[PDB]
Amino acid sequence: GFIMEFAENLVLRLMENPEERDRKAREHIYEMHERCKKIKEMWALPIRPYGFWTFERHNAQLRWDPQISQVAGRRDPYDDLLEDN
Amino acid sequence: MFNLFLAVFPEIFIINATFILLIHGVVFSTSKKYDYPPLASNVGWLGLLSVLITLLLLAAGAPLLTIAHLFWNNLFRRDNFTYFCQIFLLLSTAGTISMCFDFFDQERFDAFEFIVLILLSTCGMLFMISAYDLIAMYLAIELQSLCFYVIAASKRKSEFSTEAGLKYLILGAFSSGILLFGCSMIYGSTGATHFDQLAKILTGYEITGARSSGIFMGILFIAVGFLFKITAVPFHMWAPDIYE
């Protein structure tokens, strides 16, 4: 053929779907705003959590001392006296 | 029994390698067969290899190093923060010891005790990150402090090195005394040297409701000592002279 009859549909192939572009734009806005709200919530967390000491890793002694309160140097004076019988 | 030490291998290995390097250097620096060889670069390369190996040990023990946490509770408490902090400090030490090899032979400074002291101060630092008590905190501070006091005055020909070493010594000793005096009263007013139980007796009541003149001033002295340690203004009495 001639030049323009091919350059026309060439440019038309080069250009994209606008419906896809609009859908992607509204989508991206939706999830970006949702993620923005999520990050805003995340930044509100205090440095020290409400539980803190309640956490099992932050006790480390309520389940260690009971198995140590029997060794010498930690016993209540009234433990060795009546342990004989 | 032995498996309770799976959480201390990244440190036991570095101590053992430090001892082996010290023995090898002292044995083969006075041998008449080899005519007193300059084995500073050799010890440095072996120390870099040891640092790499203990880094590999530390990196692959991520699921480990948290076992027997009740047994080690009174001594140290290592976790994800400690794991990454140690794995980065050890990399920094490896890079520093690697970029100083040419310094040993360019200006003919074949003292292998430099490398062993770097390694042992690095072990002290590894103790510090895991340290979870005032006593271990202070002892791990003192390890690196004494290593650096020794190392700073190593080059004993220049008036700068000796005077800077002495100034670093005096400033660090004063800072350590200040920090230790700070910890003494926090122990006195509450007991509970351990960090876990120190964070639980102080969270109960705010300082604003009632004033405790002991805990506040002990915390202040600990902070002052730490600011001396990092040379933070106005506690920067001699730091530029130390670094020069």
Swiss-Prot record, chain B:
It is found in: Mitochondrion inner membrane. Exons a and b (AtMg00285) and c, d and e (AtMg01320) are cis-spliced, while a trans-splicing reaction is required to link exons b and c. Complex I is composed of at least 49 different subunits. Core subunit of the mitochondrial membrane respiratory chain NADH dehydrogenase (Complex I) that is believed to belong to the minimal assembly required for catalysis. Complex I functions in the transfer of electrons from NADH to the respiratory chain. The immediate electron acceptor for the enzyme is believed to be ubiquinone. Signal peptide: none annotated. This is NADH-ubiquinone oxidoreductase chain 2. The chain crosses the membrane at residues 4-24, 45-65, 84-104, 111-131, 134-154, 168-188, 215-235.
